[PDB]
Design a protein around this ligand. Structure first.
Ligand code: BEF
Ligand SMILES: [Mg+2]
Length: 987
């Protein structure tokens, strides 16, 4: 059974062999369940923990360091510690990542429903209806639907028991109003879900109807199943941050290979016949170079900064489901959106209402955009005590009495939920907000305040019967008699032009006057203005009967009597309600436009309500033309390629689109080379939440949209998006700062190794020393720089370029030059202990390179064994550590030097610098640690010489910042504080 909206009832009955009155036998349901399967969707289709580490260990630099470590194991035939420690980091920066991907999930199913929906099915085993599970339903079952029931599977309606059927498909098609159904089939075979007015869909609940139908699809063949299939079929690429990091790692591998082949070419010119006894030094220098040219602490500090960003975002009720998705909202330029459920509260609510005061209209405006009865009334200002207006009392009566829906507090959710029609619920919450009898709303509880006003207004009035909302009359009536008394009233609510034409009287307060044409044209004009301009509403005319016909002759069997008896009515007023946008979007869209981020609203509703809400929230103006900024599904499908391109580049409101259409729009926007960020809550945004870069979902949305997303706004707030944009921008700035710092340090170490290897000097930096430096002494300052203060106007400039590099061009020179100097300094330190060491062997300047052979004494230099003393290695390590402390101290801002920003402005940076220095002193004076590698505590004059060698790096980088920025001052505290520190070392 492909589709049943084209075939009649008898057709599908013969196709399924099921009779409506009897039901299905046990053999039939058993065979259907074995052929089609259970009515349930799979669970998250995911992978366990045993494969995430293999997925995360596929990068390039990780393989380079693995090759270096395996070469180290080979040459390490006396316990070796160099290749082991780094492995621990490979477990520290990975598991934590996994710890995120699980934890976020633990924060999603916490706000999910726990009730398994049931279903009323007629089967041949029993005579009455059977309440069974939602999974054992098979195509062919006679399912009965009532008010408030959630449809369990795709159903083709067969018999509408009630006079009408209202279905709320806002979950699937985004329609804000309850759709009316009809048993008649639609001949359109390829009709959209908004055209099949004889079918039902899973998840969509019945608003105010009741009927019986046959099942057509189930499980995966249903609409939600097809959506989940299209969602899981779509692919999700990597975030731009990870792409930049991968490009940078590729460049790093390239430069490592280049410097390694350079060292190889330089070294092969001396040694011949690759001897294998001396080739161990070549492999040692190669692994030392390969580990010095790898920022082992960079992935750890990046994961730390991303985890801190996620911890900061989770305070805004935004569960982020991955680490690198915090920066994805930093470079985003477009933010797609959904009208129903995301921008609008999806809860119909009244905004204004007018009565007539012709001895002139009195128009009040109601505040509130949800189902919570905590709103207020406003005429112009000064919230009016509504007990004075007798006409408003009559309006409250005529509206609250003619109702069938209600509100109730759900303690499991914590929000007033509707039961029944949405529009009648908006009207009853109007009643609850506007109390004409001045009842108390402070001491009573919430579950009772949900209907206190309506129960009070229903005490003195006993509803006799109800004339249901018909099609041609398009107005519903209620006959009621006032309790504790000629005394009888018949209330009517309906379409404006469908009631005024039958309204032959006018109720000015408590005075009933005949009908005049002037006030009729006036109210008709004001109603046509209320629901056709930039503030289109849903108007409801209200009229009561002065002399209702008696009940003994009132016949409720014929359809024509519903209109014949509804004559000689008097107008009481009108009500205007709509699907209101959230109170935190009108300003957030402006704050997001200031940041140069365009906001598009893609939805499946009609273009009228879409453009109305789009004007109301602030994307358009009350008079702005929308001829080229408001497209329909058919309109977008009937455009040439260039037309579609300029549309998706200029349009800002798409209405009447399918989920596949949303995916098409998102992939067009991404084809325009710009990061997108789609939000949504329904089972229609899921195919387009995965296609987007950072798919955002709402906390009150559906499970499919929350599982096809990378963020879940639990509080449904929309300013959380701009907060996350700001946080992502700050995170990226800090990240590109500390990555450049780490790379400068690494290039310094690498040029030190290259110089000490090409010149011929003995080893000055062994790998394990580089491991410890790059891990601790480089991660503490990097983690400190990850807390840089945000820019004063970070949210006032257009989004970042998608192709900008982490290592700028000219800047790549800067952090190279200083870096090179670092290397030299380190080498110098070693050379110092071989030249001007007062307690060291002053080896000849031309015989220091020839150290591998010096063993017999052939010259004045003797003791050819001190060349492995811990003192030169300690000099090099100490000067490198202090030069990196100075580099991290001055790398606090991008362009402005220290003479325009003090280093103690970022207290975390100076704190981490002091901690790293005290830890470097802690590794000298302690007993067992200086025994792992080859170091030794230094003298006072040696430390002073190291400081004298390493301090000019700050002067070099200051003057380089100056010459890069140039093409009064705050130096007084600088020349007050740092002057003794510099004048004390040169005396
Ligand atoms: F929920 Be949206 F209107 F597609
Ligand atoms: Mg929605």
């Amino acid at each position: 059974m492909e589709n049943a909206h084209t075939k009649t009832v008898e057709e599908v009955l013969g196709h399924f062999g099921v009779n409506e009155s009897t039901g299905l036998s046990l053999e039939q349901v058993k065979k259907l369940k074995e052929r089609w399967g259970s009515n349930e969707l799979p669970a998250e289709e995911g992978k366990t923990l045993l494969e995430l580490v293999i997925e995360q260990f596929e990068d390039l630099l990780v393989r380079i360091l693995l090759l270096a470590a395996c070469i180290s194991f080979v040459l390490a035939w006396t316990a070796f510690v160099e290749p082991f420690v780094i492995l621990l980091i490979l477990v520290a920066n990975a598991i934590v990542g996994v710890w995120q991907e699980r934890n976020a999930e633990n924060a999603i199913e916490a706000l999910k429903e726990y009730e398994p929906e049931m279903g009323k099915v007629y089967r041949q085993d029993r005579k009455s209806v059977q309440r069974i599970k939602a999974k054992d339903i098979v195509p062919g079952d006679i399912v009965e639907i009532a008010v408030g029931d959630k449809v369990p599977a795709d159903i083709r309606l067969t018999s509408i028991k009630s006079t009408t059927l209202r279905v709320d498909q806002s979950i699937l098609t985004g329609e804000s109003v309850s759709v009316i159904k009809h048993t008649d089939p639609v001949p359109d075979p390829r009709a959209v879900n908004q055209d099949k007015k004889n079918m039902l869909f899973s998840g969509t609940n019945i608003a105010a109807g009741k009927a019986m139908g046959v099942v057509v699809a189930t499980g995966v063949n249903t609409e939600i199943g097809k959506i989940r299939d299209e969602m899981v079929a779509t692919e999700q690429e990597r975030t731009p941050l990870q792409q930049k990091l991968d490009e940078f790692g590729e460049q790093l591998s390239k430069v490592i290979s280049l410097i390694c082949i350079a060292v190889w070419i330089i070294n092969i010119g001396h040694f011949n016949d690759p001897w294998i006894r001396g080739a161990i030094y070549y492999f040692k220098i190669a692994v030392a170079l390969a580990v010095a040219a790898i920022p082992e602490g960079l992935p750890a500090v990046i994961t730390t900064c991303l985890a801190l960003g996620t911890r900061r975002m989770a305070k805004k009720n935004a569960i982020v489901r991955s680490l690198p998705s915090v920066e994805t909202l930093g470079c985003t330029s477009v933010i797609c959106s959904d009208k129903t459920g995301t921008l609008t509260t999806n809860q119909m609510s009244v905004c204004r209402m007018f009565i007539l005061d012709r001895v002139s209209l009195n128009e009040f405006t109601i505040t509130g955009s949800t189902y919570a009865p905590i709103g207020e009334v406003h005429k112009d200002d000064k919230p009016v005590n509504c007990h004075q207006y007798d006409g408003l009392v009559e309006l409250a009566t005529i509206c609250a009495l003619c109702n069938d829906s209600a509100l109730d507090y759900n303690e499991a959710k914590g929000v007033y939920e509707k039961v029944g029609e949405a529009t009648e619920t908006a009207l009853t919450c109007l009643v609850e907000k506007m109390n004409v009898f001045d009842t108390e709303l402070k001491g009573l509880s919430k579950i009772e305040r949900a209907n206190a006003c309506n129960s009070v207004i229903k005490q003195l009035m006993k509803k006799e019967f109800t004339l249901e909302f018909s099609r041609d009359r398009k107005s519903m009536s209620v006959y009621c008699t006032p309790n504790k008394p000629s005394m009888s009233k018949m209330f009517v609510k309906g379409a404006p032009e469908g009631v005024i034409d039958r309204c032959t009287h006018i109720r000015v307060g408590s005075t009933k006057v005949p009908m005049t044409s002037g006030v009729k044209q006036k109210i008709m004009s004001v109603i046509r203005e209320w629901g056709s301009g930039s503030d289109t509403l849903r108007c409801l005319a209200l009229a009561t009967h002065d002399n209702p016909l008696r009940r003994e002759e009132m016949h409720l069997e014929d359809s024509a009597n519903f209109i014949k008896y509804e004559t000689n009515l008097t107008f009481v007023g009108c009500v205007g309600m709509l699907d209101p946008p959230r109170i935190e979007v009108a300003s957030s869209v402006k704050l997001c436009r200031q940041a140069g981020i365009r906001v598009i609203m893609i939805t499946g509703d009609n273009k009228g309500t879409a453009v109305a809400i789009c004007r109301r929230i602030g994307i358009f103006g009350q008079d702005e033309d929308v001829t080229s900024k408001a497209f329909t599904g058919r309109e977008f499908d009937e455009l040439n390629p260039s037309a579609q391109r300029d549309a998706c580049l200029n349009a800002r409101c798409f209405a009447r689109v399918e989920p596949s259409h949303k995916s098409k729009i998102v992939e067009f926007l991404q084809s325009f080379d710009e990061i997108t960020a789609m939000t949504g809550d329904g089972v229609n945004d899921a195919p387009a939440l995965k296609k987007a870069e950072i798919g955002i979902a709402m906390g009150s949305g559906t499970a499919v949209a929350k599982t096809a997303s990378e963020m879940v706004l639990a509080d449904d707030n929309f300013s959380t998006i701009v907060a996350a944009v700001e946080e992502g921008r700050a995170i990226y700035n800090n990240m590109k700062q500390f990555i450049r710092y780490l790379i400068s340090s690494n290039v310094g170490e690498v040029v030190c190794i290259f110089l000490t290897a090409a010149l011929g000097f003995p080893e000055a930096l062994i790998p394990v020393q580089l491991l410890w430096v790059n891990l601790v002494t480089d991660g503490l300052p990097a983690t400190a720089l990850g807390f840089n203060p945000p820019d004063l106007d970070i949210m006032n400039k257009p989004p970042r370029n998608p192709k900008e590099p982490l290592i700028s061009g000219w800047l790549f020179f800067r952090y190279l030059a200083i870096g090179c100097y670092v290397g030299a300094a380190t080498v110098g330190a070693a050379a110092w202990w071989f030249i001007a060491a007062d307690g060291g062997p002053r080896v000849s300047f031309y015989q220091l390179s020839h150290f591998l052979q010096c063993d017999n004494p052939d010259f004045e230099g003797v003791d050819c064994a001190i060349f492995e003393s811990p003192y030169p290695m300690t000099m090099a390590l100490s000067v490198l550590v202090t030069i990196e402390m100075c580099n991290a101290l001055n790398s606090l801002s991008e362009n402005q030097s220290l003479l325009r920003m003090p280093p103690w402005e970022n207290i975390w940076l100076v704190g981490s610098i002091c901690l790293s220095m005290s830890l470097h002193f802690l590794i000298l004076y302690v007993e067992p640690l200086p025994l792992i590698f080859q170091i030794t505590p230094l003298n006072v004059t040696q430390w002073l010489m190291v400081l004298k060698i390493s301090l000019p790096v700050i002067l070099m980088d200051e003057t380089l910042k100056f010459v890069a920025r140039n093409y009064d001052g705050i130096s007084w505290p600088f020349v007050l504080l740092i002057m003794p520190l510099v004048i004390w070392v040169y005396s």
